[PDB]
Write a protein that binds this ligand. Structure first.
Ligand SMILES: [Ca+2]
Length: 496
């Protein structure tokens, strides 16, 4: 469960948030495969409630109606086609599994679903599964509202409705079986793993019982006996009865402290400085590296819909964002997940964005295709951070130094730091309010290296800055505090 199952040499996954199956298939062959990406996390592929007020919000996909592979992203045939094409080019697919609940109990009965399936939250009737009143925790929950009111109570957090979402009785073999049936269908199609949504709201034992009924990965692409990669979405920030470690037996867990702390440091908040990142990792109270899934931001907290809140860095803060993602990709702690989002009309009303519900680029509900501009960027309002030179080149950086130890760390006691990875890569950061000009030990063999942040290496040529490493692995670095990108990165594969 703990192994990503990615092709050897691929160390990251990208969350192509709300992308259509056909666009992901193309992206796999035209970009992800050749640029070294390990995998892709897709939005929930199962049928959900169609919400028209607001209008097709992004969160409607976290309200299941059935387990039919029928969504705004595409149908079953298109999903199968995408998984096959991606696996054929060495890019894995990870599915966002929404198995803790169904749709909101206050949602109107009818056929307002992505596949026309009928459902009735009022009577707990979901005939397309099929599920009935006997498959929910309405009798288990002992709160007055029926929803979760006390997070200091593990039992209600697990047996009560999370913000009104119908809570499934995962202790029932029938329900566990229906879920495993859905996940096994996806495994046979070819998915390499799953993101367990709202894992904190499920008992670790119930999850285990479900994983027990899962098949091994498709033997056409994976070695026999291969188990699906499992990462559970658990928001653990410190003083709650429920701990991330409670889920270590099922697989990896999302480390939400990673992005929250990194954002605070990069922003130079609460007195933090990049100099403290010397012991970054478990030393900061994070879960063991071999059990962590890290990221700077995600679809939830990038809108303020999650853990971290205000310190979270996202594409809106491009300069600091690129620096944060760069540091994460260069650091050996955990398995890294990169975010890929879309732009929305942000509107704040006293510190709160009233348009945080806005769904993906669309034409009257129909998701707009991802267009590629001549400069390899995306159009139609898709941000495509994974296509940003500074981010994509750092993704490759992590692959190149995969395995090398954290070494040659340097810091000025403030916000100017540098460190290498064995003898395969070196990165320098200048987050202070003054220029950086110093000769440092890189631990890299002598030669001319192309800075992969300001440019690229193309057939014995650099399109950006060039770094000269001498015989003793020493090299000079100059980064102005006013530089577009205040950091430099070089590695074994960027050497001329
Ligand atoms: Ca639950």
């Amino acid at each position: 469960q703990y192994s990503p199952n990615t092709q050897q040499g691929r160390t990251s996954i990208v969350h192509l948030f709300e992308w259509r199956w056909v666009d992901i298939a193309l992206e796999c062959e035209r970009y992800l495969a050749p640029k070294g990406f390990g995998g892709v996390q897709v939005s929930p592929p199962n049928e959900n409630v169609a919400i028209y007020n607001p209008f097709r919000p992004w969160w409607e996909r976290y309200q299941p109606v059935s387990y039919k592979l029928c969504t705004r992203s595409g149908n079953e045939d298109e999903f199968r086609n995408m998984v096959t094409r991606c696996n054929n080019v060495g890019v894995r697919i990870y599915v966002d599994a929404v198995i803790n609940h169904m749709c909101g109990n206050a949602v109107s009965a009818g056929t307002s679903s992505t596949c026309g399936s009928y459902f009735n939250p009022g009577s707990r009737d979901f005939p397309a599964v099929p599920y009935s009143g006997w498959d929910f925790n309405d009798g288990k929950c002992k709160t007055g509202s029926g929803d979760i009111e006390n997070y200091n109570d593990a039992t209600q957090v697990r047996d009560c409705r999370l913000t009104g979402l119908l809570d499934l009785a995962l202790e029932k073999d029938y329900v566990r079986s229906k879920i495993a049936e859905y996940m096994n269908h996806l495994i046979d199609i070819g998915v390499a793993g799953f993101r367990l949504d709202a894992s904190k709201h499920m008992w670790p034992g119930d999850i285990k019982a479900i994983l027990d009924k899962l098949h091994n990965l498709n033997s056409n692409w994976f070695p026999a006996g291969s188990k699906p990669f499992i990462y559970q979405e658990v928001i653990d920030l410190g003083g709650e009865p429920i701990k991330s470690s409670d889920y270590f037996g099922n697989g990896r867990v999302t480390e939400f402290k990673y992005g929250a702390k990194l954002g605070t440091v990069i922003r130079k908040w609460n007195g933090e400085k990049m100099s403290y990142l010397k012991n970054w990792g478990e030393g900061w109270g994070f879960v063991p590296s071999d059990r962590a899934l890290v990221f700077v931001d995600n679809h939830d907290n990038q809108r303020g819909h999650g853990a971290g809140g205000a310190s979270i860095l996202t594409f809106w803060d491009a300069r600091l964002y690129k620096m944060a993602v760069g540091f994460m990709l260069a650091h050996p702690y955990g398995f890294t997940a990169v975010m890929s989002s879309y732009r929305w009309p942000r509107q704040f009303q006293n510190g709160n964005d009233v348009n945080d519900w806005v769904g993906p680029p669309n034409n009257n509900g129909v998701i707009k295709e991802v267009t590629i501009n001549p400069d390899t960027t995306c159009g139609n309002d898709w941000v495509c951070e994974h296509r940003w030179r500074q981010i994509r080149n750092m993704v490759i950086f992590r692959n190149v130094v995969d395995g090398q130890p954290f070494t040659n760390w340097y810091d000025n006691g403030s916000n100017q730091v540098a460190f290498g990875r064995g003898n395969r890569g070196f990165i320098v950061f200048n987050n202070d309010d003054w220029s950086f000009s110093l000769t440092l030990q890189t631990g890299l063999p002598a030669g001319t290296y192309c800075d992969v942040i300001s440019g690229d290496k193309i057939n014995g040529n650099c399109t950006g800055i060039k770094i000269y490493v001498s015989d003793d692995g020493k090299a000079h670095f100059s980064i102005s505090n006013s530089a577009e990108d205040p950091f430099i990165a070089i590695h074994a594969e960027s050497k001329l």
